[PDB]
Design a protein around this ligand. Structure first.
Ligand code: HEM
Ligand code: HEM
Ligand SMILES: O=C(CCc1cccnc1)N[C@H](CS[C@@H](Cc1ccccc1)C(=O)NCCc1cccnc1)Cc1ccccc1
Ligand SMILES: O=C(CCc1cccnc1)N[C@H](CS[C@@H](Cc1ccccc1)C(=O)NCCc1cccnc1)Cc1ccccc1
Lengths: 461, 461
């Protein structure tokens, strides 16, 4: 209890922390339930301790804007430190201060609307591959696991949009390029290892000196040389790798060869499990709400008659599709929390925040607050209609974060998931099965995923 | 050898480092001899590794000025990190960046010429106490250990100038205020513990979590409450403590109660062993060079006839005394090295210095370089005469450092040591004894102290 008397001093309420452990024992229900309860007991501002690390939770929209937008470069610039990361310190997700701002600029033109429009035909090719693999399982007459069929699709999109490798991952399960990427899994920060790290942050320097890395050394070395071969096999003869090689041929230094591999890993970590997991939550909501699925199938057929292929402009034309995606992200924000580290003794919106405190934003908790959402736990896509989309605070609904350090691949993820939804709904309808978890239960761990895999009925139109 | 290929890359020469150990095995001769040899093999710029910590040594005066003066606030602002320090992170010697610049401003008016002139009568009282204790050992007819008789004097000056406690430390060896201060000793950075810290910097966070501190917890707690009692016993009814209490009654926050104790400890650590050790080197040079001692005794009697007491203005009037002090500090710079941490990827005087490299200045080595000093190893006080003092580069002879992070107690130390020299030379002459080490040998460790204690003959005038 070296720093366990900080919130009691400032008059900030919070759960009483145990020595050394802090409030980590309250995570037995998960990040989601611990945040909703604390928002109920203590109100708009409260604090707790991840071991000895003080964590201050804020829920005021004006104060969230100051943290994410206003005082970003000066104060709240970096995220919660974690390790051991090894060479992955050079990744944009982990870099801090000027190293981050240099990396953010070197990768910003990669995610413009112009580059995304050129990636549409490539991504769309695997939409047709997704249908053929789904139609073979549709004539099977048995339930289908969504994250398996969606995992293969997201895999194909990553391998093509990031490295220009075109594989049918579902039909090539033993492909060398597919086998390594499936070894990358989302970090469970409530698992025994990462919890021990949070309780024993002083053990991180020991793991770093032993070359131990939370990123498996095998997968990193595989991509570290696959790039240096493609940097010498493509050279000389539209993917993420090509756009990064063009960047080092111009803040304000060129992108390093090792840094190139770091951001490539971060792109795979981003658009793989997240895309497949979000697409699964959507098809769960479409199957349990057939009225919503039927209405969307009728909107798609209007813009795209005769099952016409979607384009960059026809996707952005669909609004009910955007409503369904936004509503699903509300009930399942894979981020759950948004965190920033306070680097100075500052005072924002009439409250003193000392140096070193991690400022946290319970995104999942604010998405289900009755103070802003009527019938929060219900799947009502009409909240995001142009009629009602104005009654939504842009700092309460933040599925892609906000400010200079938001999700740099937002429009890519949205376009990727919508293209999948469109082609799938142009050929199939989805019915609930017997083993379908109704209502779905979220995992008690540190990841926003269902307890049991989503299984539904797939029929051909 | 994670970072052991940095100097080989930049083309900077240096001794070949062993894995994990680096170049620490070369310290078997001491900081002094390792620096002189490296200045001889590799020239003006070279590098080595304290374990895995790269250390770049520079000897160009224009480049030293850029590090200590020009690019101080922007780049070279902090010193080499070391620990565990505990609460002593709040001390000016250890604080970094804005915490340091806030502390430096809060303590700068404490060391002005006005405050020092008011401390002269208090310090001068223990000059008379020093003579009586020396005259009793003068009629003894036996050799006298200088650091013992000088240690008591420096002790009395600290206890009076910092806390207003007036004790005859030599005649009160069991005084509670004297017993704790003698427990503070200069840190030997070549001892088994601090060497293990340099080789295992990742063990510092473990020692910090165990409340282990290189400053003994007993002495710290003693002064931590002695201040809070004197802050409530003096209150309400010219020392360092009083000047600091007046500062918190005005960058830009008041000085903390805990921070007050931190700087008090740093003052004791500064002006105790250093003052007694430097005063010993001077009396060694005066005894081995009687021509110098006789000339200084004649300069003192001119300004101060009939053994008149010295004042703030009569001390600054003496020039040969200043010459002798400066020349002794040349041959025995207790700093030996001057170090700064490079916080950015900068490039100064046509050389790239990456982030995290400790920039070092071999002060001891430059003080004995024949390229700037004729007959370096000889005690020739005439180098600092107004005739020849102009042929001295202010960035080669830096006994008190240089720049915004120099010794903030320079003029206090000089005035303190000169007052001691004047009163002592007004009543005694110093002859070499049989057990007197001639020539004196420096310690092979990490401290600039003699191998054997200086013993001389003391006679009454
Ligand atoms: C449904 C899909 C996705 C969602 C909901 C999502 C959400 C988020 C959120 C909430 C953040 C943190 C924002 C903040 O800290 O304020 C973030 C960061 C980030 N996202 Fe995503 N993301 C998704 C997919 C992707 C994809 C496909 C990419 C492709 C490159 C990507 C790249 C990144 C990066 C690099 C960051 C870190 C940015 C930085 O630290 O500067 N994300 N994402
Ligand atoms: C013969 C006596 C002394 C010598 C030769 C000496 C020398 C030095 C040197 C070389 C430095 C480092 C300068 C740099 O990094 O560039 C230093 C720092 C310092 N000295 Fe002294 N010193 C002496 C006595 C004292 C005394 C009596 C005090 C009383 C307060 C003192 C207070 C300090 C402090 C606080 C620092 C650190 C300054 C900072 O980090 O901002 N020193 N000293
Ligand atoms: O950017 C990516 C990764 C790519 C991505 C994923 C999803 C969406 N967009 C991008 N994570 C970003 C946050 S850093 C992540 C560690 C990481 C993990 C992988 C790579 C780099 C750093 C973390 O939460 N540390 C917290 C440390 C901690 C917590 C509790 C207790 N003790 C320690 C943004 C993000 C995260 C989660 C969802 C959405 C966005
Ligand atoms: O300011 C004081 C102390 C007071 C003082 C003493 C003498 C003159 N004036 C002031 N030290 C200052 C330097 S920090 C000292 C640690 C310290 C020690 C005590 C308190 C705070 C920090 C250090 O060298 N770390 C290096 C870490 C290291 C080295 C090698 C290998 N691995 C690790 C200035 C100074 C030092 C020496 C002589 C003159 C000035």
């Amino acid at each position: 209890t070296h720093s366990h008397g900080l919130f009691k001093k400032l008059g900030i309420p919070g759960p009483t922390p145990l020595p050394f452990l802090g409030n980590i024992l309250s995570y037995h229900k998960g990040f989601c339930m611990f945040d909703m309860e604390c928002h109920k007991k203590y109100g708009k501002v409260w604090g707790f301790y991840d071991g000895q690390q003080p964590v201050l939770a804020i829920t005021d929209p004006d104060m969230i804007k100051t943290v994410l937008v206003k005082e970003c470069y000066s104060v709240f610039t970096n995220r919660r430190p974690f390790g051991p990361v090894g060479f992955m310190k050079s990744a944009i997700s982990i870099a801090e201060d000027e190293e981050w701002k240099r990396l953010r600029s070197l990768l910003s033109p990669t995610f413009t609307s112009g580059k995304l429009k050129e990636m549409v035909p490539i991504i769309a090719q695997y939409g047709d591959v997704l249908v053929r693999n789904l139609r073979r399982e549709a004539e099977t007459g048995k339930p289908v696991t969504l994250k398996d069929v969606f995992g293969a699709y997201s895999m194909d999109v990553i391998t093509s949009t990031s490295f220009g490798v075109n594989i049918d991952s579902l039909n090539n399960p033993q492909d060398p390029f597919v086998e390594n990427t499936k070894k990358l899994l989302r970090f469970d920060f409530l698992d025994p290892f990462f919890l021990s790290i949070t309780v024993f942050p002083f053990l991180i320097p020991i793991l770093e000196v032993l070359n131990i890395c939370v990123f498996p050394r095998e997968v990193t070395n595989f991509l570290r040389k696959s790039v240096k071969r493609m940097k010498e096999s493509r050279l000389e003869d539209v993917d993420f790798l090509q756009l990064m090689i063009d960047s080092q041929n111009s803040s304000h230094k060129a992108l390093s060869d090792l840094e190139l591999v770091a951001q490539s890993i971060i792109f795979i970590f981003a658009g793989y499990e997240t895309t497949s997991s979000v697409l699964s939550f959507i098809m769960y909501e479409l199957a349990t709400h057939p009225d919503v699925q039927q209405k969307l199938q009728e909107e798609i057929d209007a813009v795209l008659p005769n099952k016409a292929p979607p384009t960059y402009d026809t996707v952005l034309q669909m609004e009910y599709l955007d409503m369904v995606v936004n509503e699903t992200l509300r009930l399942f924000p894979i981020a759950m929390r948004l965190e920033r580290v306070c680097k100075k003794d500052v005072e924002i919106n009439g409250m003193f925040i000392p140096k070193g405190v991690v400022v946290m934003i319970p995104s999942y908790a604010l998405h289900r607050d009755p103070k802003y959402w009527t019938e929060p736990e219900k799947f009502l896509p009409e909240r995001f209609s142009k009629k009602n989309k104005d009654n939504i605070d842009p700092y309460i609904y933040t599925p892609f974060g906000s400010g200079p350090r938001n999700c740099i691949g937002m429009r890519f993820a949205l376009m990727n998931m919508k293209l999948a939804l469109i082609r799938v709904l142009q050929n199939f309808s989805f019915k609930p099965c017997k083993e379908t978890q109704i209502p779905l239960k979220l995992s008690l761990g540190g990841l926003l995923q269902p307890e049991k895999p989503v299984v539904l009925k797939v029929e051909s139109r």
